[PDB]
Design a binder for this molecule. Structure first.
Ligand code: HEM
Length: 110
């Protein structure tokens, strides 16, 4: 398998390194990056992102719904363009397929 859990962990390391302020929107606001994996709010959230990736791969991803929910948190195109870059790094680091098309689908609804 691809270890998508590991890809997602590196995604968040990249994301919050480049944009620490994005972490303020989550239940793990203020938690040291190096300790995120031990945080309960983070574990649940990371699991859902993994689920979304597996839903995209499996053909059931709802990009319109995901976009709508993110707009509902005042998260928009600029943030998802930054996420796209961080996710490409995380995928590359693990020899995982690029997920750019999945992010482009979300971006099309933003
Ligand atoms: C690769 C890009 C991203 C993916 C695949 C993704 C996916 C998800 C998923 C699956 C959830 C779980 C709830 C739901 O399904 O709506 C979620 C929640 C959330 N996302 Fe993202 N997201 C991405 C980028 C971002 C970015 C850049 C931000 C910027 C702050 C963000 C902010 C949030 C917030 C605030 C929540 C809710 C957290 C909570 O309920 O406590 N997302 N996201």
């Amino acid at each position: 398998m691809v270890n998508w859990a590991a890809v997602v962990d590196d995604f968040f390391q990249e994301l919050f390194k480049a944009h620490p302020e994005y972490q303020n929107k989550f239940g793990f606001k203020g938690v040291a990056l190096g300790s995120l994996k031990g945080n309960a709010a983070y574990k649940t959230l990371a699991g859902k992102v993994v689920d979304y990736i597996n839903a995209w791969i499996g053909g059931s991803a709802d990009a319109a719904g995901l976009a709508s929910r993110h707009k509902g948190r005042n998260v928009g195109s600029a943030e998802f363009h930054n996420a796209k870059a961080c996710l490409a790094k995380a995928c590359s680091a693990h020899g995982a397929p690029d997920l750019g098309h999945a992010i482009d689908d979300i971006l099309s609804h933003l």
